[PDB]
Amino acid sequence: TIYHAKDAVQATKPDMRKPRLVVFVVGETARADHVSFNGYERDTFPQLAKIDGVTNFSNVTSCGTSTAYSVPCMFSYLGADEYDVDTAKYQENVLDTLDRLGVSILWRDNNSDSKGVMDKLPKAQFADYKSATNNAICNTNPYNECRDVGMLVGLDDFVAANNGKDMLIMLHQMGNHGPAYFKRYDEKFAKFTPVCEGNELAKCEHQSLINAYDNALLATDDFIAQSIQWLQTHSNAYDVSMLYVSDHGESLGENGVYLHGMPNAFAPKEQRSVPAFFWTDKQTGITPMATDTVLTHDAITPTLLKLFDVTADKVKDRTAFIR
Ligand SMILES: [Au+]
Ligand SMILES: [Au+]
Ligand SMILES: [Au+]
């Protein structure tokens, strides 16, 4: 392991103040320009709009355009300019640091896996929610596809087992992951119709493609809102907060480009312009940065450290999502 945060210290501990419980939703394939709050022509995010204390960040750029590239960068100390995907697995990352300081780290996954991020930590702290062995919400659609909302089921038991400790829970979403946007949501979120149902996105009627994509966003709005609602049930005993950031955007036929993964050197804007949301309870003392702060995935690591009152010289000056 190559360390950059051996100086990390927690200024206040959970035995001397309210313990902190945070959910970080690691989003998948969501575009900033398809969010209602960013100026989109459709109400793709209605449930989040009914919750007080949610900050929408209108200017967030992802480290890259693929899950394998972006996800390790999101938890890196190095920042996008110095990040190396091929050696990321051997670097101390922000979750290693928090775990060493006693924060209880949980990673649930309905996407694929942590892309290296969890590899140094006990495997018991990673759980696969793509399979019904763990996910109880798969039989809600004709595909028997495990849903993101299934990752909230049983978190109270996790909280009960970590009673009184600081907790950081990562929920790695399937979210809008393609090309089969139409399989990413249940019938209740099929509001924009008709929808594209083929793997050849270029042959699908363009409007029908956008419709399927936006319906999947409604399913993600629902999931994020339910994550906040779950946190709201522990607001008296814990300082609760929720961070959402998508790993990268998506092309939907602009200049003939579909799906994601374009090399950063010529990646279109829509593959790197991502939504981010931050929610916190009024008691936590956490203050969001301005909604239009120029932000990137580099802000995630300092946000997570600040949420748990942790300092580290490597990201001392780095802009975060919160003050
Ligand atoms: Au669009
Ligand atoms: Au992704
Ligand atoms: Au179109």
Residue numbers in the entry: 219 to 541
Could you give the paper's own sentences about this structure?
NDM-1, as a typical member of B1 class of MBLs, possesses two Zn(II) ions intercalated by a nucleophile hydroxide in its active site, which is delimited by flexible loop 3 and 1023. The two Zn(II) ions have been validated to be crucial for its hydrolytic activity to launch a nucleophilic attack on β-lactam rings in β-lactam antibiotics.
Since AUR is a prodrug and metabolizes to an active species [Au(PEt3)]+ when transferred across cell membranes, we therefore used an AUR analogue, chloro(triethylphosphine)gold(I) [Au(PEt3)Cl], for all the enzyme-based biophysical studies to mimic its action in cellulo. The crystal structure of Au-MCR-1-S was resolved at 1.68 Å resolution and the binding of Au(I) to the MCR-1-S was also confirmed by X-ray excitation spectrum. The bond lengths of Au(I) with the side-chains of amino acid residues are overall slightly longer than those for Zn(II), probably owing to the larger ionic radius of Au(I) (1.37 Å) than Zn(II) (0.74 Å). The third Au ion (Au544) coordinated to Nɛ2-His424 and a water molecule in a quasi-linear geometry (N–Au–O angle of 159.0°). The Au ion (Au543) was only observed in one chain in the asymmetric unit with occupancy of ~0.3, but not in the other one, inferring the less accessibility of Au(PEt3)Cl to this site. The crystallographic analysis demonstrates that AUR binds to MCR-1 and displaces Zn(II) in the active site through Au(I). We show that the Zn(II) ions in MCR-1 could be irreversibly kicked out by AUR and form an Au-bound MCR-1 with Au(I) coordinating to Glu246, Asp465, His466, and TPO285. Although there is no cysteine residues in the active site of MCR enzyme, to our surprise, unlike Bi(III) drugs, AUR also targets MCR-1 protein at its zinc-catalytic core through the side-chains (εN) of histidine residues, suggesting that the “softness” of histidine (e.g., εN) is tunable by a protein.
